[PDB]
Amino acid sequence: QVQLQESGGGLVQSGGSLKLSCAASGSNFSSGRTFSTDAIGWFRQAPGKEREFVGGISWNGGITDYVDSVKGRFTISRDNAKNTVYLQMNSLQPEDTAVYYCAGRDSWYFSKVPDEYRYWGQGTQVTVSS
Amino acid sequence: SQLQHNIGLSIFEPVAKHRANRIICTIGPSTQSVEALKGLMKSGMSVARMNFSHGSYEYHQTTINNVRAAAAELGLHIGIALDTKGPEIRTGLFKDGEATYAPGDTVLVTTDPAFEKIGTKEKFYVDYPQLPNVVRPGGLIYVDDGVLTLRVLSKEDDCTLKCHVNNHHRLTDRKGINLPGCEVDLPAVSEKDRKDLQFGVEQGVDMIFASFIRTADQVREVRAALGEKGKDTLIISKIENHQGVQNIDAIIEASDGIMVARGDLGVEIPAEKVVVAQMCIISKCNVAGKPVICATQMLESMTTNPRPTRAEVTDVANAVFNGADCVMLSGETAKGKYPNEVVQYMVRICIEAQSATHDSVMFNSIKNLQKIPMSPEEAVCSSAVSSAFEVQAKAILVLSNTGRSARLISKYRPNCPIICATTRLLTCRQLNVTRSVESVYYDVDAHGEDNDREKRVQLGVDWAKTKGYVSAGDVMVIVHADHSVKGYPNQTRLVRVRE
């Protein structure tokens, strides 16, 4: 219904930084839900793993949570007027090398369970070499 | 019990309900484009409303032609509703659109067409010709919903009066008057009102929102005007004064649905009363199994702001809880900066309210009021919802060509979509104001005559499946008519959906 579009991956230097961007279209006309009504989660899938949580943001941005590994290093924000979610990743490390997806849940609140989200982006590669 | 259901709610769990209520949108300057209508329709609009207190027949032909086209493009059945001007001392077209009056100011009040639009702080025009002959020096002239009040001081001329301004106010073009004395003997259909209705019958509108309906005999007047070219179009009485509320029972009986014009009511009755008046009118409409609409003041402040107020939202929620079949936006959608967002706020309010009501209680209530012996027709639709509940059905599929059946089946307020499979388009369109119904058109000319009623049932079941209602191994509830009945449906069938 709602589609998410990722962008911003690539190669970065150990200690460098990237800003992941997620742009949203359509709607769930059935529920009257749009990007701005829905919480957004950021998940990453490291090589050969499943897809763990990084951080999440409530519908109007009033609440966010982060996995401890990225706390103080990553920041999720959103501009509902531009239909976009941002993940700002600073002091990137080799351990953050993974593919990152944004996902939108049909709820005002976010979750850390991948199976609880309704629409995803295709995902973008992030590789940090030292 | 709601009490149980309430303590079982979680704000965090997603809601699952397929929306049961219907959203009525008013068309106007910001939504009249085909692309805009298409956005209204995608965002949940079931009937487009043509407010005829404004615009020419050319503006309103543009709307008809444009929703039909937008509808077509979407392959949907959208209703068209002609809201009448109504009998209404009305007055405006101010010079520069406006004028402001201070207490103590003296202002002419003329029934001369010469100042009908060069209306200034000093001389303006009141549509009622009998004003000098019905309002005497001393009494008051309520201007713009009991807000600005004028004390009459003299019949200055043959058709002009010189009046004393009580309270300050800013009057914009076209403000309604509420002369506090009755015996104004106001007609049910002004001469324009008539002429606007042939134009509606002539263009094939699905329903009239007849305005300022006071007594049942007026709802007869509206009818007769519609003619026989329009015998089959819906009349929705607009209850907007104490007389409507007073005779709500014979107005309901003689109308086809009721609209609660909440704001218009609140000119004459207190807010705390209006609350009750809505509970009351809506519920009487439930019991009569007639469609009831909430009207004025819905998500008002989302006409200029990207979000409405929490109070306005518990307001819409209440109209749903109260039992409304539809909510109607006006100005939120007609002159507003966020039409698609407001309409999508309305969808989310309905689903959340729907999700929050016990599924059964309305059924039980409406059932426990029915007198016994029930009639066959009543029992058939009653037992349908009942069976559906009992076997856990995911959709009721009724075959009705006028749709009377779907309005009966919805009167028991099931907890699943009603899929109406009709051979009339008008019926598709008109059913838009009845809770839980979703019509599906069987073009007889295009296909067989479907006397075995088999194609039509497939039609309904195909839809139920593609619309996401029902899936392999779900039980469905078919309500049609036997080959040996005068009219009405008397046959019901409990099928299982096969892969």
Numbering used by the authors:
A (entry chain G): 1 to 130
B (entry chain A): 2 to 500
From the publication, what sentences describe this entry?
Pyruvate kinase (PYK) represents another attractive glycolytic target. This non-glycosomal enzyme catalyses the last step of the glycolysis (the irreversible conversion of phosphoenolpyruvate (PEP) to pyruvate; Figure 1A). Like most PYKs, trypanosomatid PYKs are homotetramers. Because of their role in ATP production and distribution of fluxes into different metabolic branches, the activity of trypanosomatid PYKs is tightly regulated through an allosteric mechanism known as the ‘rock and lock’ model. By using a combination of enzyme kinetics assays, circular dichroism (CD) spectroscopy and macromolecular X-ray crystallography (MX), we demonstrate that sdAb42 (one of the sdAbs raised against TcoPYK) is a potent inhibitor that impairs enzyme function by selectively binding and stabilizing the enzyme’s inactive T state.
Second, we were also able to crystallise the sdAb42:TcoPYK complex in the presence of sulfate, which acts as a phosphate mimic that can bind both the active and effector sites of trypanosomatid PYKs. As a result, sulfate binding has the potential to initiate the ‘rock and lock’, thereby ushering the transition from the inactive T to the active R state. A detailed inspection of the electron density revealed the presence of sulfate molecules in the TcoPYK effector site at the positions usually occupied by the phosphoryl groups of the cognate effector molecules fructose 1,6-bisphosphate and fructose 2,6-bisphosphate. Despite the presence of these sulfates, TcoPYK clearly remains in a T state conformation when bound by sdAb42. When taken together, the data strongly indicate that sdAb42 impairs TcoPYK activity by selectively binding and stabilising the enzyme’s inactive T state. A thorough structural investigation reveals that this inhibition proceeds through an allosteric mechanism, in which sdAb42 selectively binds the enzyme’s inactive T state, thereby ‘locking’ TcoPYK in a catalytically inactive conformation.
